[PDB]
Design a binder for this molecule. Structure first.
Ligand code: FE
Ligand code: FE
Lengths: 479, 479
């Protein structure tokens, strides 16, 4: 394959496309013999050169990595998420879909096809692996063999056209809670709220409208509510006609937080929109209720964090204003006005990719992990694992050294009823000087001493998005 | 896996064990659209940590790489050669066989098992892939799927216990010509000569004895003769009992060249042994007859080339005396004495891994390729591809640059009846600074301009041994 000689396709961003199997990877330290399950993660990775001759990172085809940890060893299986795009392009021997979220650039042969790359999450639910991209229904896959099933529309009961890549699991029921924005077509202001039962059946789909179409990438869930931030990374057909990146950031628009009842009978008038000044947030650590209030913890930045989705008024990217710090947004459902009850920065540590012990989804919670950017460290940039204790305020940091960077952590519980945060953190480390990757395993509440085990891969993973652990019994692997 | 922190298992020698599939690898330049077939090569690569806690390179399990070149692209498939050793150790979850060519160090559970790692050649013949190790019958594999069949003993017609990893194909018949040394058991002086017809049936097996047991790694074949050099890298049960490496070099023993009739009716008295002073040679570029003479071209060194098989009298390794240069050994079957007719250095270029256009096997020939060690080049060591023209004397060199090294080249003919050397050279390049490998494709008689195509692998291969091209119709791949 002849790929462009551009930054998105070179160096750390060289196309990989490795499908492989390796058991018993070379490792150092002690892999807890308690562990029996697998960590799934996804990397965008282009099957073919892009039609335009360049592209962005968020547009590579989804390649799924599984790290099966058992018997004190770690194995790898890596396979493509075989979306309709993947299959059509594979059969044609070339790219047929064009630029990111831009159907105007697709070959005529694939008009009316799902454009999903399934490249944003590798999530386990209802005995399936969900390879997820927020512009289409989720793909599903067999978590044991990693074969692909297809797109999931729940027996026709899902009528929305899209499904999130940030599903939540409510611990009170085991339901998956999801959204789909642009639900009636590209750039529409319609959103669906979905709840799926543990058996994988759609329970309900509820439609509503938002203040403006924008990237609704993530959200929070509480017992009673969907908690939906409205942040003006906006897109439009006009942008696409003009050849611009689908999204761009508008610093002149307000930010909202919508509190939407988790109810099949939802009506637009049931929703409360709280309003604040322009800022940027993408991911949700967790949300929870307290009295008549809703709290959501997000990495908040002063301005846009996506250089590839630029300022709509032509301003150059501002890295300093893109620094994000975990911040609690609180709204009171009993309040008179639409003002937030409070906005409170929770740490001065800059970071992103927030995670919790997912058994605390929607509940008051003590611990949060993030990828941290510590710009004071020497470097030759997400260079630390960070843990925040909301009860005491305490912070832990672990630095991966001067020639490495880190990918999103994932929490592994010791047992179903173990206390919050009792378990391990796993995360990919990019060993950039060695052009390879490690899988690191930490004691989840004692990270400063470093990983208790380091699993070496004999090749490099690419930049990853989201990932998750599941125990073996949830994914068809050996007890 | 916990591997030793020793040079044989670290850095470039880190265990890989990658089984993978990647079509349409990222590449630069122009892959000739004429090419339609595959290059197979083998790397020793340990499935498990060694029993002793250290080992040597020549003892890793054989991992087979196939580069399928077609339609102007290159694909990779990499799979283990599943020897009985591989299978037994895989089932046990640990190493059971011990040190190199040393049955005394094996677990009792595998007494009486073939110790083959099938790690020395990946050769195509009779519709099969032969994964070869000279201490046992060859393994065979499906060249299309790369599944393993098992060990080949030709319907019981092979009674020798071993088979070479340097088979030759006689162009006059299409027969495979092979030897097996230590044919009646470890360290014995018995050798078999075998010829196999193009259909894969054993034609004959002929037994003879050699002046002394030694590493009989390679040999030449002419129309009438097996041409067998006797070089004193010697082994013995006593060495093994004393815990020494199986082989060690004895500078006090003479070197012989045996001329053995290619005849099922061979008797010991039919053989002529020519004798010369101590020196070292391992590989054969080619052998051929002229009148009553036999010529064989070998990389000759003054002393041992294997530091891991040390001088039997305790001398430290001498790298200067290990420099090998292509040299013609000529013997006259009509001569009165046992002296060589002549020994003539053919180049001052130092190198090894000699190859020809294999359609010239056993015949007078014009071209030879080698891996060259040019110690005058900057380096931050096999660093050049070398081509010798025996007709004009001309030499070509291509240097892979200051941070790379090269593996064995293989010649690809343009067509069955194309002239000698009309075609391409393929070879793996170790891009050590990038911890990855390239496959290089050269115009076989115009190498100084560099490769016409460079195929990037998204991972590193390990040190390789021998490899071969076959056209698609010889290996079950698409026309
Ligand atoms: Fe995300
Ligand atoms: Fe050899």
């Amino acid at each position: 394959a002849h790929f462009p000689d551009t930054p998105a396709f070179t160096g750390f961003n060289a196309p990989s496309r490795i499908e492989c199997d390796i058991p018993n990877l070379v490792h150092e330290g002690t892999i807890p013999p308690e562990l029996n399950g697998a960590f799934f993660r996804v990397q965008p990775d282009p099957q073919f050169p892009p039609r335009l001759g360049d592209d962005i990172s968020f547009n590579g085809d989804g390649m799924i990595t599984r790290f099966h940890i058992h018997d004190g060893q770690c194995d790898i299986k890596q396979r493509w998420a075989k979306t309709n795009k993947w299959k059509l392009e594979n059969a044609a021997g070339k790219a047929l879909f064009g630029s990111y979220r831009n159907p105007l650039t697709d070959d005529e042969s694939v008009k009316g096809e799902y454009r999903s790359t399934a490249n944003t999450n590798a999530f386990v639910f209802a005995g399936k692996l969900w390879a997820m991209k927020e512009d289409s229904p989720s793909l599903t896959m067999d978590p044991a063999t990693m074969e692909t099933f297809g797109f999931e529309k729940f027996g026709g009961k899902m009528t929305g056209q899209t499904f999130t890549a940030h599903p939540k699991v409510d611990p009170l029921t085991g339901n998956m809670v999801a959204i789909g924005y642009a639900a009636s077509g590209l750039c529409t202001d319609d959103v669906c709220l979905y709840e799926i039962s543990p058996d994988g059946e759609l329970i309900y789909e509820a439609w509503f409208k938002v203040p403006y179409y924008c990237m609704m990438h993530d959200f929070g869930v509480t017992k009673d509510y969907l908690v939906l931030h409205i942040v003006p990374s906006i897109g439009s057909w006009d942008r696409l006609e003009k050849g611009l990146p689908h999204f761009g950031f508008d610093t002149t628009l307000p930010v909202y937080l919508g509190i939407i009842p988790r109810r099949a009978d939802l009506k637009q008038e049931d929703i409360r929109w709280f309003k604040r000044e322009n800022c940027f947030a993408s991911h949700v650590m967790n949300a929870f209720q307290e009295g008549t209030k809703v709290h959501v913890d997000v990495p908040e930045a002063e301005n846009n964090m996506f250089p590839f989705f630029p300022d709509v008024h032509g301003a150059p990217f501002n890295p300093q204003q893109a620094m994000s710090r975990l911040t609690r947004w609180t709204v009171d459902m009993a309040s008179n006005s639409d003002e937030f009850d409070s906005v409170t920065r929770l740490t001065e540590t800059a970071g992103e990719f927030p995670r919790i012990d997912d058994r605390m989804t929607g509940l008051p919670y003590r611990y949060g992990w993030m990828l941290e950017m510590d710009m004071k460290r020497p470097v030759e940039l997400m260079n630390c694992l960070f843990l925040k204790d909301h009860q005491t305020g305490a912070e832990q940091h672990w630095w991966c050294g001067p020639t490495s960077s880190l990918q999103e952590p994932a929490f592994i519980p010791r047992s179903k009823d173990a206390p919050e945060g009792d378990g391990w953190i796993v995360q990919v480390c990019n060993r950039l000087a060695d052009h390879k990757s490690d899988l690191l395993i930490f004691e989840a509440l004692d990270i400063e001493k470093g990983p208790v085990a380091t699993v070496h891969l004999p090749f490099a993973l690419r930049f990853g998005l989201h990932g998750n652990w599941a125990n073996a019994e949830e994914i068809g692997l050996a007890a």
